[PDB]
Amino acid sequence: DPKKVLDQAKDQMENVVRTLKQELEELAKEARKLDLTQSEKIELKLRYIVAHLAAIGDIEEAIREAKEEADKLKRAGLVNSQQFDEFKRRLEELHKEADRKRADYAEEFRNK
Amino acid sequence: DPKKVLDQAKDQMENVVRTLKQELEELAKEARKLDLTQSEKIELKLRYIVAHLAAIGDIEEAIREAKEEADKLKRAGLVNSQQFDEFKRRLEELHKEADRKRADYAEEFRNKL
């Protein structure tokens, strides 16, 4: 069901944004610790960069799995050309609106 | 102007959601203080409940006042029918976005406690 594929992706792309929020808040808590060695300060700064790449990457992997799942329904004959082009049209809308919500939290914790 | 009415509901709901945030943070800080009678803990529970019911109700009455604003522009034919459909679609997206943050703050407060 092409509708189920869009809903499956919006759950995953929201779950990635919530995972990003929790990882940035866990780093903000550890930035306040007064007993950070040299090993742990550089680790926290690089973990901040990875937290963003992992969000960008898991957003793309959610779009990729959704685009592959619709191609299977197309090749099976369960989806016509009118449903296919509609599905990519609304997938880009979910792709761009999740790309903003990720930038909204990233701008929120970058103001520290 | 239908876009103004959408943006009025956004700011009115972000204030509601911010007011819950400020209220819940204050309740979190006063919950940890030692020396609390069995009734003082109940008074905080009571202030929490009212804070919750105010957020739920005011989110609802912001959507309702926006719909009554839209139906008032339709009564005088100031809005096209194709617009009226588009306004309802973006209003409930503002509704889902506001209730998500509201339910987050209440859940974030329950975990910290």
Numbering used by the authors:
A (entry chain B): 170 to 281
B (entry chain A): 170 to 282
What does the literature reporting this entry say, word for word?
BCL-2 protein family members BAK and BAX are the gatekeepers of mitochondrial apoptosis. Homooligomers of BAK and BAX form pores in the mitochondrial outer membrane (MOM) and release apoptotic factors into the cytosol, committing the cell to destruction. We use computational protein design to generate high affinity binders of BAK and BAX with greater than 100-fold specificity for their target. Both binders activate their targets when at low concentration, driving pore formation, but inhibit membrane permeabilization when in excess.
As a starting point for design, we used as a scaffold a de novo designed protein BINDI that binds with high affinity to BHRF1, a viral prosurvival BCL-2 homolog. BINDI has high stability (resistance to thermal and chemical denaturation) and therefore is likely to be tolerant of the mutations necessary to enable interaction with BAK and BAX, and we demonstrated previously that the three-helix structure of BINDI can be redesigned for altered BCL-2 family specificity. During the design and evolution of αBAK2, we generated two lower affinity constructs for BAK, αBAK1, and CDP02, which bound to BAK with Kd values of 7 and 60 nM respectively. Five rounds of FACS under specificity-enriching conditions yielded binders with high affinity and specificity. αBAK2 binds BAK with 400 ± 200 pM affinity and 333-fold specificity. αBAX2 binds BAX with 3 ± 2 nM affinity and 100-fold specificity. αBAK2 differs by 12 mutations (10%) from precursor αBAK1 and 22 mutations (19%) from BAK-CDP02. αBAX2 differs by 10 mutations (9%) from precursor αBAX1 and 18 mutations (15%) from BAX-CDP01. Crystal structures agree with the computational model and confirm the BH3-mimetic binding mode of αBAK2 with BAK.
